[PDB]
Coordinates of C-alpha atoms in Angstrom, one line a residue:
Chain A
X1 CA -99.2 -182.3 111.7
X2 CA -100.9 -185.1 113.6
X3 CA -104.6 -185.6 113.0
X4 CA -106.8 -188.6 114.0
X5 CA -107.8 -189.0 110.4
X6 CA -106.8 -187.4 107.1
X7 CA -110.1 -185.5 106.5
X8 CA -110.8 -183.9 103.2
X9 CA -107.1 -183.2 102.7
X10 CA -105.4 -184.4 99.5
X11 CA -101.8 -184.2 98.5
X12 CA -101.5 -180.8 97.1
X13 CA -104.1 -179.1 99.2
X14 CA -103.3 -175.6 100.3
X15 CA -102.2 -173.9 103.5
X16 CA -103.5 -170.4 104.4
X17 CA -102.5 -167.6 106.8
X18 CA -105.0 -164.7 106.9
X19 CA -106.5 -166.5 103.9
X20 CA -103.3 -166.0 101.9
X21 CA -101.7 -169.2 100.5
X22 CA -98.3 -169.6 102.2
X23 CA -97.7 -173.3 101.6
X24 CA -99.1 -176.7 100.7
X25 CA -99.6 -180.2 102.0
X26 CA -96.6 -182.3 100.9
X27 CA -97.4 -185.9 101.9
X28 CA -99.5 -187.9 104.3
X29 CA -98.7 -191.2 106.1
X30 CA -99.9 -193.4 108.9
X31 CA -97.7 -193.3 112.0
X32 CA -96.5 -196.7 113.3
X33 CA -99.2 -196.8 115.9
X34 CA -102.5 -197.2 113.9
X35 CA -104.3 -194.4 115.8
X36 CA -103.2 -191.3 113.8
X37 CA -102.3 -189.8 110.5
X38 CA -99.2 -187.7 110.1
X39 CA -99.6 -184.9 107.6
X40 CA -96.4 -183.0 106.8
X41 CA -96.7 -179.6 105.2
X42 CA -94.3 -177.3 103.3
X43 CA -94.4 -173.6 104.2
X44 CA -92.7 -171.3 101.7
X45 CA -89.3 -169.7 102.3
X46 CA -90.3 -166.1 103.0
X47 CA -93.2 -167.2 105.2
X48 CA -91.1 -169.3 107.6
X49 CA -91.3 -166.5 110.1
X50 CA -95.0 -166.9 110.4
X51 CA -94.9 -170.4 112.0
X52 CA -94.2 -170.2 115.8
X53 CA -94.0 -172.7 118.6
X54 CA -97.4 -171.6 119.8
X55 CA -99.1 -171.8 116.4
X56 CA -102.3 -173.8 116.0
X57 CA -103.4 -175.5 112.8
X58 CA -107.0 -176.1 112.0
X59 CA -108.9 -177.7 109.2
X60 CA -111.1 -175.6 106.8
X61 CA -112.6 -178.0 104.2
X62 CA -116.0 -178.6 102.7
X63 CA -119.2 -176.7 103.2
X64 CA -121.2 -176.5 106.4
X65 CA -124.7 -175.1 106.2
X66 CA -126.5 -174.2 109.5
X67 CA -130.2 -173.5 110.1
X68 CA -130.3 -171.0 113.0
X69 CA -133.0 -169.1 114.8
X70 CA -134.0 -165.5 113.8
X71 CA -132.2 -166.0 110.5
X72 CA -130.0 -168.8 109.2
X73 CA -126.7 -167.4 107.8
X74 CA -125.3 -169.8 105.3
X75 CA -122.3 -167.9 103.9
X76 CA -120.0 -169.2 101.3
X77 CA -116.5 -167.8 101.9
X78 CA -113.8 -170.0 100.4
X79 CA -114.3 -171.7 97.0
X80 CA -110.9 -173.5 96.7
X81 CA -111.4 -175.3 100.1
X82 CA -114.6 -177.0 98.9
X83 CA -113.1 -179.1 96.1
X84 CA -109.7 -180.0 97.6
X85 CA -109.5 -178.9 101.2
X86 CA -107.3 -176.5 103.1
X87 CA -105.5 -175.9 106.4
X88 CA -105.3 -172.5 108.0
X89 CA -103.2 -171.5 111.0
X90 CA -102.6 -168.8 113.6
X91 CA -99.4 -166.9 114.5
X92 CA -99.2 -165.8 118.1
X93 CA -97.5 -162.5 119.0
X94 CA -94.5 -163.4 121.2
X95 CA -93.1 -166.9 120.7
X96 CA -90.0 -168.4 119.2
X97 CA -90.2 -169.4 115.6
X98 CA -90.6 -173.2 115.2
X99 CA -88.3 -175.1 112.9
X100 CA -87.0 -178.5 111.8
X101 CA -89.9 -181.0 111.8
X102 CA -91.7 -179.7 114.9
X103 CA -95.0 -181.5 115.4
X104 CA -98.4 -179.8 115.7
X105 CA -101.9 -180.9 116.4
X106 CA -104.5 -180.4 113.6
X107 CA -107.8 -179.2 115.1
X108 CA -110.9 -180.0 113.1
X109 CA -112.4 -176.5 113.2
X110 CA -111.7 -172.9 114.0
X111 CA -113.8 -173.2 117.1
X112 CA -111.8 -176.1 118.4
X113 CA -108.5 -174.1 118.1
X114 CA -109.5 -171.3 120.4
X115 CA -107.0 -170.5 123.1
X116 CA -108.0 -170.6 126.7
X117 CA -107.8 -172.5 130.0
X118 CA -109.1 -176.0 130.5
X119 CA -111.5 -176.1 133.4
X120 CA -112.6 -179.5 134.7
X121 CA -116.2 -180.0 135.8
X122 CA -117.9 -182.6 137.9
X123 CA -121.5 -182.5 136.5
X124 CA -124.6 -184.2 138.1
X125 CA -125.9 -185.6 134.9
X126 CA -125.4 -184.8 131.2
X127 CA -129.1 -184.5 130.5
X128 CA -129.5 -181.4 128.4
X129 CA -125.8 -180.8 127.9
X130 CA -124.1 -181.0 124.5
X131 CA -120.5 -181.9 123.8
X132 CA -119.7 -178.6 122.0
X133 CA -122.8 -176.5 122.3
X134 CA -123.3 -175.6 126.0
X135 CA -122.0 -172.1 126.8
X136 CA -120.8 -170.4 129.9
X137 CA -122.6 -167.1 130.4
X138 CA -121.2 -164.2 132.4
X139 CA -123.2 -160.9 132.4
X140 CA -125.3 -162.5 129.6
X141 CA -122.3 -162.8 127.3
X142 CA -120.8 -166.1 126.1
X143 CA -117.5 -166.6 127.9
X144 CA -116.8 -170.3 127.7
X145 CA -117.8 -173.5 126.0
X146 CA -118.4 -177.0 127.2
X147 CA -115.9 -178.9 125.0
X148 CA -116.0 -182.4 126.5
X149 CA -118.5 -184.7 128.2
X150 CA -117.7 -188.2 129.5
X151 CA -119.3 -190.9 131.6
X152 CA -116.6 -192.1 134.0
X153 CA -117.1 -195.5 135.6
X154 CA -119.1 -195.5 138.8
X155 CA -121.9 -193.5 137.1
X156 CA -120.0 -190.2 137.4
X157 CA -120.5 -187.7 134.5
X158 CA -117.5 -185.3 134.2
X159 CA -116.8 -182.8 131.6
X160 CA -114.4 -179.9 130.9
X161 CA -114.6 -176.4 129.6
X162 CA -112.4 -173.8 127.7
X163 CA -112.9 -170.3 129.1
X164 CA -111.9 -167.0 127.6
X165 CA -108.5 -165.7 128.9
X166 CA -110.0 -162.3 129.8
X167 CA -112.2 -164.1 132.4
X168 CA -109.6 -166.5 133.9
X169 CA -108.8 -163.9 136.7
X170 CA -112.4 -164.3 137.9
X171 CA -112.1 -168.1 138.5
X172 CA -111.1 -168.2 142.2
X173 CA -111.5 -170.2 145.4
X174 CA -115.2 -169.6 145.9
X175 CA -116.5 -169.2 142.3
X176 CA -119.6 -171.1 141.5
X177 CA -120.6 -172.6 138.1
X178 CA -124.2 -173.6 138.2
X179 CA -126.4 -174.7 135.3
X180 CA -129.5 -172.7 134.5
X181 CA -132.7 -174.2 133.2
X182 CA -134.6 -172.4 130.4
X183 CA -137.5 -171.2 132.4
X184 CA -140.8 -170.1 130.8
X185 CA -141.0 -166.3 131.1
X186 CA -144.4 -164.7 130.9
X187 CA -143.1 -161.1 130.8
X188 CA -140.3 -161.7 128.3
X189 CA -141.6 -164.2 125.8
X190 CA -138.3 -165.3 124.2
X191 CA -137.7 -168.2 121.8
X192 CA -133.9 -167.9 122.1
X193 CA -133.9 -169.1 125.7
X194 CA -136.1 -172.1 124.9
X195 CA -134.2 -173.1 121.7
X196 CA -130.8 -173.2 123.5
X197 CA -131.8 -175.2 126.6
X198 CA -129.3 -175.8 129.5
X199 CA -126.8 -173.0 130.1
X200 CA -123.8 -172.7 132.5
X201 CA -123.8 -169.5 134.6
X202 CA -120.7 -168.0 136.1
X203 CA -120.8 -166.1 139.4
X204 CA -117.3 -165.0 140.7
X205 CA -115.7 -164.8 144.0
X206 CA -112.3 -164.0 145.7
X207 CA -109.3 -166.0 146.8
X208 CA -106.9 -168.6 145.5
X209 CA -107.2 -169.3 141.8
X210 CA -108.6 -172.8 141.2
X211 CA -109.0 -174.7 137.9
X212 CA -111.7 -177.4 138.8
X213 CA -115.2 -176.9 140.0
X214 CA -118.3 -178.9 141.1
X215 CA -121.6 -178.3 139.4
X216 CA -124.8 -179.0 141.4
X217 CA -128.4 -179.1 140.1
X218 CA -130.6 -176.0 140.2
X219 CA -132.3 -176.8 143.5
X220 CA -129.0 -177.5 145.3
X221 CA -127.3 -174.4 144.0
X222 CA -128.2 -172.2 146.9
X223 CA -126.4 -174.5 149.4
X224 CA -123.0 -174.0 147.9
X225 CA -122.9 -170.2 148.0
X226 CA -119.8 -168.9 149.9
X227 CA -122.0 -167.7 152.7
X228 CA -125.2 -169.5 153.4
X229 CA -127.4 -170.3 156.5
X230 CA -128.6 -173.9 156.3
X231 CA -131.3 -175.0 158.7
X232 CA -132.7 -178.4 159.3
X233 CA -136.3 -177.9 160.4
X234 CA -138.6 -180.8 161.3
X235 CA -142.3 -181.3 160.9
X236 CA -144.9 -184.0 161.5
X237 CA -146.2 -183.8 157.9
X238 CA -145.0 -182.3 154.6
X239 CA -148.0 -179.8 154.6
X240 CA -147.7 -179.8 150.8
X241 CA -144.3 -178.2 150.9
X242 CA -142.3 -179.4 147.9
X243 CA -138.6 -179.3 147.4
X244 CA -138.3 -176.0 145.6
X245 CA -140.8 -173.7 147.5
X246 CA -139.8 -170.1 148.1
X247 CA -139.1 -168.9 151.7
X248 CA -140.6 -165.6 152.8
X249 CA -139.9 -163.0 155.4
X250 CA -142.1 -159.9 155.5
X251 CA -143.6 -160.7 152.1
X252 CA -140.3 -160.8 150.1
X253 CA -138.5 -164.1 149.2
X254 CA -135.3 -164.4 151.3
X255 CA -134.5 -168.1 150.9
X256 CA -135.5 -171.4 149.5
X257 CA -136.3 -175.0 150.6
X258 CA -133.6 -177.3 149.5
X259 CA -134.8 -180.9 149.9
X260 CA -137.5 -182.9 151.8
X261 CA -136.6 -186.2 153.5
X262 CA -139.2 -188.5 155.0
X263 CA -138.1 -190.2 158.3
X264 CA -139.9 -192.5 160.7
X265 CA -140.5 -189.6 163.1
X266 CA -141.9 -187.3 160.5
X267 CA -140.8 -185.0 157.6
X268 CA -137.4 -183.2 157.9
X269 CA -136.8 -180.2 155.7
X270 CA -133.6 -178.4 154.9
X271 CA -133.8 -174.7 154.1
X272 CA -131.3 -172.1 153.1
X273 CA -131.0 -168.4 153.6
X274 CA -129.4 -165.9 151.3
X275 CA -126.3 -164.0 152.7
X276 CA -127.9 -160.6 152.6
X277 CA -130.8 -161.7 154.8
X278 CA -128.5 -163.8 157.1
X279 CA -128.3 -161.0 159.7
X280 CA -132.0 -160.4 159.8
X281 CA -133.4 -163.7 161.2
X282 CA -131.4 -163.0 164.4
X283 CA -131.4 -166.6 165.8
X284 CA -134.9 -166.7 167.3
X285 CA -137.7 -167.3 164.9
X286 CA -140.9 -169.2 164.1
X287 CA -141.4 -171.1 160.9
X288 CA -145.0 -171.0 159.5
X289 CA -146.4 -173.0 156.5
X290 CA -147.7 -170.9 153.6
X291 CA -148.8 -173.9 151.4
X292 CA -152.4 -174.3 152.8
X293 CA -155.4 -172.0 152.9
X294 CA -157.5 -171.7 156.0
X295 CA -160.7 -169.7 156.3
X296 CA -162.4 -169.0 159.7
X297 CA -165.8 -167.4 159.4
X298 CA -167.8 -166.1 162.4
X299 CA -170.0 -163.3 163.6
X300 CA -167.0 -161.3 165.0
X301 CA -164.1 -163.6 163.9
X302 CA -163.5 -163.4 160.1
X303 CA -159.9 -164.1 159.0
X304 CA -157.9 -165.7 156.2
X305 CA -155.0 -167.7 157.5
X306 CA -151.9 -169.2 155.9
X307 CA -152.0 -167.8 152.4
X308 CA -152.9 -165.3 149.8
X309 CA -153.8 -166.7 146.3
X310 CA -150.5 -165.5 144.7
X311 CA -148.7 -166.8 147.8
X312 CA -150.7 -170.1 147.6
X313 CA -149.4 -171.0 144.2
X314 CA -145.9 -170.1 145.4
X315 CA -146.4 -171.8 148.8
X316 CA -143.5 -172.2 151.2
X317 CA -142.4 -171.3 154.7
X318 CA -142.8 -168.0 156.4
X319 CA -140.4 -166.6 159.1
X320 CA -141.6 -164.9 162.2
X321 CA -138.3 -163.2 163.3
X322 CA -137.4 -162.5 166.9
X323 CA -135.0 -160.2 168.6
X324 CA -131.9 -162.2 169.7
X325 CA -130.8 -165.8 169.9
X326 CA -128.1 -168.3 169.0
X327 CA -128.8 -170.1 165.8
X328 CA -129.6 -173.6 167.0
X329 CA -129.5 -176.5 164.6
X330 CA -133.1 -177.7 164.6
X331 CA -136.3 -175.8 164.4
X332 CA -140.0 -176.9 164.4
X333 CA -142.3 -176.1 161.5
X334 CA -145.7 -174.9 162.8
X335 CA -148.9 -175.7 161.0
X336 CA -150.2 -172.1 160.8
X337 CA -149.7 -168.7 162.3
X338 CA -151.8 -169.1 165.5
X339 CA -150.1 -172.4 166.5
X340 CA -146.7 -170.6 166.1
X341 CA -147.8 -167.9 168.5
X342 CA -149.0 -170.4 171.0
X343 CA -145.9 -172.6 170.5
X344 CA -148.1 -175.7 170.1
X345 CA -146.5 -178.1 167.6
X346 CA -148.9 -181.0 168.5
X347 CA -152.2 -181.3 166.7
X348 CA -154.2 -181.4 170.0
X349 CA -153.3 -178.9 172.7
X350 CA -151.2 -179.5 175.8
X351 CA -153.1 -180.9 178.7
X352 CA -152.3 -178.4 181.5
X353 CA -154.7 -179.1 184.3
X354 CA -156.8 -182.3 184.7
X355 CA -160.2 -182.9 186.4
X356 CA -162.0 -185.8 187.9
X357 CA -165.8 -186.2 188.2
Chain B
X1 CA -121.3 -145.3 123.1
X2 CA -123.6 -147.2 125.4
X3 CA -123.2 -148.4 128.9
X4 CA -125.5 -151.5 129.0
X5 CA -126.7 -153.4 132.1
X6 CA -126.1 -156.8 130.6
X7 CA -125.8 -158.2 127.1
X8 CA -128.5 -160.8 127.6
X9 CA -130.7 -160.7 124.5
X10 CA -128.5 -158.3 122.6
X11 CA -126.7 -159.3 119.4
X12 CA -123.4 -157.8 118.0
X13 CA -125.0 -156.7 114.7
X14 CA -128.7 -157.4 115.0
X15 CA -130.2 -155.2 117.7
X16 CA -131.9 -152.1 116.1
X17 CA -132.7 -148.7 117.5
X18 CA -136.4 -147.9 116.9
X19 CA -137.8 -144.4 116.6
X20 CA -141.5 -144.0 115.7
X21 CA -141.4 -147.8 114.9
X22 CA -138.8 -147.3 112.2
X23 CA -135.2 -148.7 112.3
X24 CA -132.9 -145.8 112.9
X25 CA -129.7 -147.3 114.3
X26 CA -127.9 -150.6 114.8
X27 CA -126.0 -152.0 117.7
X28 CA -122.6 -152.7 116.0
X29 CA -120.4 -153.6 119.0
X30 CA -120.8 -155.5 122.3
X31 CA -117.9 -156.0 124.8
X32 CA -117.3 -157.1 128.3
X33 CA -115.0 -154.6 129.9
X34 CA -113.2 -155.7 133.1
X35 CA -115.0 -155.2 136.3
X36 CA -118.1 -156.9 134.9
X37 CA -119.2 -153.9 132.8
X38 CA -120.9 -154.6 129.5
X39 CA -120.5 -151.7 127.1
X40 CA -121.4 -151.4 123.5
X41 CA -121.7 -148.8 120.8
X42 CA -124.2 -147.9 118.0
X43 CA -124.2 -146.3 114.6
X44 CA -127.2 -144.0 114.1
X45 CA -128.7 -142.5 110.9
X46 CA -127.5 -139.0 110.3
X47 CA -131.1 -137.7 109.9
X48 CA -131.7 -138.5 113.5
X49 CA -128.4 -137.2 115.0
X50 CA -130.1 -133.8 115.7
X51 CA -132.4 -135.6 118.2
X52 CA -129.6 -137.0 120.4
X53 CA -129.4 -134.3 123.0
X54 CA -128.7 -133.8 126.7
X55 CA -131.8 -135.6 128.1
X56 CA -132.4 -138.2 125.4
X57 CA -133.0 -141.6 126.7
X58 CA -132.2 -144.9 125.1
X59 CA -134.0 -147.8 126.8
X60 CA -134.3 -151.4 125.8
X61 CA -137.7 -152.8 125.2
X62 CA -138.7 -156.4 126.0
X63 CA -140.8 -158.3 123.4
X64 CA -144.0 -158.5 125.5
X65 CA -146.8 -160.9 124.8
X66 CA -149.7 -159.0 123.2
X67 CA -153.2 -160.4 123.5
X68 CA -154.8 -157.8 121.2
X69 CA -152.1 -157.7 118.5
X70 CA -150.8 -161.3 118.1
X71 CA -147.6 -160.6 116.3
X72 CA -144.8 -163.1 115.5
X73 CA -142.4 -160.3 114.4
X74 CA -142.0 -158.9 117.9
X75 CA -141.3 -162.3 119.4
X76 CA -138.9 -163.4 116.7
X77 CA -136.7 -160.2 117.0
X78 CA -136.4 -160.1 120.8
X79 CA -134.7 -157.2 122.6
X80 CA -135.0 -153.8 120.9
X81 CA -133.5 -150.3 121.8
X82 CA -136.1 -147.5 121.8
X83 CA -135.2 -143.9 121.3
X84 CA -137.1 -141.1 123.1
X85 CA -135.7 -137.6 122.3
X86 CA -135.2 -134.5 124.4
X87 CA -133.7 -131.0 124.2
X88 CA -130.4 -129.4 125.1
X89 CA -126.7 -129.9 124.5
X90 CA -125.9 -132.6 121.9
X91 CA -124.2 -135.6 123.7
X92 CA -122.7 -138.7 122.1
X93 CA -122.8 -141.2 125.0
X94 CA -125.7 -142.6 126.9
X95 CA -126.5 -145.0 129.8
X96 CA -129.0 -147.7 129.2
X97 CA -131.0 -149.0 132.3
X98 CA -133.2 -152.1 132.5
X99 CA -136.9 -152.0 131.8
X100 CA -138.0 -151.6 135.4
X101 CA -135.5 -148.8 136.2
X102 CA -136.3 -146.9 133.0
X103 CA -139.0 -144.6 134.6
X104 CA -136.5 -143.2 137.1
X105 CA -134.3 -141.6 134.4
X106 CA -136.9 -139.5 132.7
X107 CA -136.0 -135.8 132.5
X108 CA -138.8 -135.0 134.9
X109 CA -139.8 -137.6 137.5
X110 CA -141.2 -137.6 141.0
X111 CA -139.4 -140.3 143.1
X112 CA -140.8 -141.2 146.5
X113 CA -139.4 -143.6 149.1
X114 CA -142.4 -145.0 150.9
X115 CA -142.1 -147.4 153.9
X116 CA -144.2 -150.3 155.0
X117 CA -144.1 -153.0 157.7
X118 CA -144.6 -155.7 155.1
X119 CA -144.4 -156.2 151.4
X120 CA -148.2 -156.8 151.1
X121 CA -147.5 -158.8 148.0
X122 CA -146.3 -155.7 146.1
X123 CA -143.7 -156.8 143.6
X124 CA -141.1 -154.6 141.9
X125 CA -143.1 -153.8 138.7
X126 CA -146.6 -153.2 140.0
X127 CA -148.6 -150.4 138.4
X128 CA -149.5 -147.3 140.5
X129 CA -153.0 -145.9 140.3
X130 CA -154.8 -142.6 140.9
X131 CA -158.5 -142.4 140.1
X132 CA -158.5 -145.7 138.3
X133 CA -155.8 -144.8 135.7
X134 CA -152.2 -145.8 135.9
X135 CA -150.0 -142.8 136.7
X136 CA -146.8 -144.3 137.9
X137 CA -144.9 -147.4 138.7
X138 CA -143.1 -149.1 141.6
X139 CA -139.4 -149.2 140.9
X140 CA -137.8 -151.6 143.4
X141 CA -138.5 -153.2 146.8
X142 CA -135.8 -153.4 149.5
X143 CA -136.0 -155.3 152.7
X144 CA -134.6 -153.6 155.8
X145 CA -134.5 -154.5 159.5
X146 CA -137.4 -152.1 160.2
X147 CA -139.6 -153.3 157.4
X148 CA -140.1 -153.0 153.7
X149 CA -139.1 -149.8 151.9
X150 CA -140.5 -149.2 148.4
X151 CA -139.4 -146.7 145.8
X152 CA -142.0 -145.4 143.5
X153 CA -142.0 -143.0 140.5
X154 CA -144.6 -140.7 139.1
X155 CA -144.9 -139.7 135.4
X156 CA -144.3 -135.9 134.6
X157 CA -147.9 -135.3 133.4
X158 CA -149.4 -136.4 136.7
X159 CA -146.6 -134.8 138.8
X160 CA -148.8 -131.7 139.4
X161 CA -151.8 -133.7 140.5
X162 CA -150.6 -135.5 143.7
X163 CA -150.2 -132.0 145.3
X164 CA -147.8 -133.0 148.1
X165 CA -150.4 -134.4 150.5
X166 CA -151.5 -138.0 149.8
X167 CA -152.2 -141.4 151.2
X168 CA -150.9 -144.6 149.7
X169 CA -153.1 -147.6 149.8
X170 CA -152.3 -151.2 148.8
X171 CA -154.2 -152.7 145.9
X172 CA -152.6 -156.2 146.0
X173 CA -154.9 -157.9 148.5
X174 CA -158.6 -158.6 148.4
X175 CA -160.8 -158.0 151.5
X176 CA -164.4 -158.9 151.9
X177 CA -166.5 -157.7 154.8
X178 CA -170.0 -159.3 155.0
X179 CA -172.7 -158.1 157.3
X180 CA -176.4 -157.4 157.8
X181 CA -175.9 -153.8 156.9
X182 CA -172.2 -153.6 156.1
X183 CA -171.3 -155.3 152.8
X184 CA -168.2 -154.0 151.1
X185 CA -165.3 -155.1 148.9
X186 CA -162.1 -153.5 149.9
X187 CA -158.7 -153.2 148.4
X188 CA -159.2 -154.6 144.9
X189 CA -161.2 -155.4 141.8
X190 CA -160.4 -158.7 140.0
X191 CA -158.8 -156.9 137.0
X192 CA -157.0 -154.6 139.6
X193 CA -156.1 -157.7 141.6
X194 CA -154.0 -159.3 138.9
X195 CA -152.4 -155.9 138.3
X196 CA -152.0 -155.0 142.0
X197 CA -150.1 -152.1 143.1
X198 CA -150.5 -148.9 145.1
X199 CA -153.4 -146.4 145.1
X200 CA -153.0 -142.7 145.8
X201 CA -155.6 -140.8 147.8
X202 CA -154.7 -137.2 146.8
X203 CA -155.1 -134.2 149.0
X204 CA -155.3 -130.5 148.4
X205 CA -151.9 -128.9 149.3
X206 CA -148.6 -129.9 150.8
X207 CA -144.9 -129.9 150.4
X208 CA -143.6 -133.1 148.9
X209 CA -141.8 -134.7 151.9
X210 CA -139.3 -137.4 151.3
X211 CA -140.9 -140.4 153.1
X212 CA -144.5 -141.6 153.2
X213 CA -146.3 -144.5 154.9
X214 CA -148.0 -147.3 153.0
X215 CA -151.4 -148.1 154.6
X216 CA -152.7 -151.6 154.6
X217 CA -156.1 -150.8 153.1
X218 CA -158.4 -147.8 152.5
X219 CA -160.0 -147.6 156.0
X220 CA -156.6 -147.6 157.8
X221 CA -155.5 -144.8 155.5
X222 CA -158.6 -142.7 156.4
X223 CA -158.0 -143.3 160.1
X224 CA -154.3 -142.7 159.7
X225 CA -153.4 -145.9 161.6
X226 CA -150.3 -147.5 160.3
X227 CA -150.0 -150.0 163.1
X228 CA -151.8 -153.3 163.0
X229 CA -153.5 -152.8 166.4
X230 CA -155.1 -149.4 167.0
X231 CA -153.7 -146.6 169.1
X232 CA -154.4 -146.8 172.9
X233 CA -156.0 -143.4 173.6
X234 CA -157.6 -143.7 177.0
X235 CA -156.9 -146.5 179.5
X236 CA -158.9 -148.0 182.3
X237 CA -158.4 -149.7 185.6
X238 CA -160.7 -152.2 187.3

């Protein structure tokens, strides 16, 4: 067995299979390269059938006490492993039995010796991510585990993940892995979401099976759906529209603003539309700001334009859908609803007929 | 056996089954079957097994934030299965639905699909009000090409009282009309504004038709004018 260091293992520490002692550690020696330690064990004669080519050896030594939320289960299972140390191993179902000084890697924990498929990730930044603590949720259940996190040169954070072999059929050509922020929920006041932090979410697709993905931040996640309708809409001013504002047709949120870029001409937005609603905008539309309130009072004209108070704290862009058109690249962003009906993007109205006096 | 929506806040040996506030059962298994179907199973106390019958619902309760009863025990536990019994043939497998959809699967329920030209700020979980008291709940909101189609539900106690003829008025938006003689506040009160929802104007007698319209405020429901601009009745030439 080849480990990066000896650990708590002494000469004469014990080897377990199903917590039954089936051997012992015979010797230990440094290999000629100074990186590793070679630990050679001695399985008993009648238990030689247990060791296979696909067997995995892990280290069970010492005591580890954890303080966890909603109870902290510190359970003391093995007493002989505390004083001297131990090595347990697995036996896979269908493999040839290993023999005659075959090498094996010694994992440091049972959690490190889980079988699965390595999946490489290209992360934006390892901000709230942890080297062995960030899970991959699917349907709310833990599927994978971020097992590595590195800073490659050029300022590129890349990591990799071991996923459960039941789920490997879902990882396909357009399968997105996006990281979820632990948002503050007013209806479901949960401490478990806030205590965990960042969490990878799996959403499957169909096609060719791939084994490497690109993770984008939470705002940019809508752009990389397998179907999406991405529109660059221009404006002379931001109108208080931030990067993450919701986008509304007929009162219900159908899309999201992606990012806001300031140019010399004005403010250029980039919005996205969900695939279910993609058919419904129908290529001809007006885009109205919902971020600002406007009150017109009068003897006959009393109206509240641009918002409602729940829509004001959300803000965003409203679609006025039309009947039929080709989805052109650029659109204008009108200041309110009445300027969108008049098709008057400019602040002061179009001079149509002049006069002299 | 349980057919769960998602195992989000559920734990393999820590999620209890409450009945009358007391722990009756215990979620003992939680699996992800292929096809993206989370299923689990539960061991219940043999005293309670007589209650599990043909229309007996098991719905999961969220640990809601209580302002009157500031309890840490509810927030520290999290998700919790609630048992509500019924009568009939004893069954041994159930279907758990999320907290919003739980009202649909009561043994008696009155489910109405009501249409609208706009959402009017009515979310999925808004309360539904007759005579000031909550009698039902909006279930879900679906956007179609024609407009916004809601699906609401009515509790069985109030099922008799809508009486088949009714008007459905939005409570989500405020409206103030000021005038020399006409001063009125339409559509809300401030406690009703943060709740929002749909108000019923009940009538005397009718057959419960499938679809209903959702009127924008109370005066458009009395005039029976669903459209934004009023019906042209007589025209003129000049």
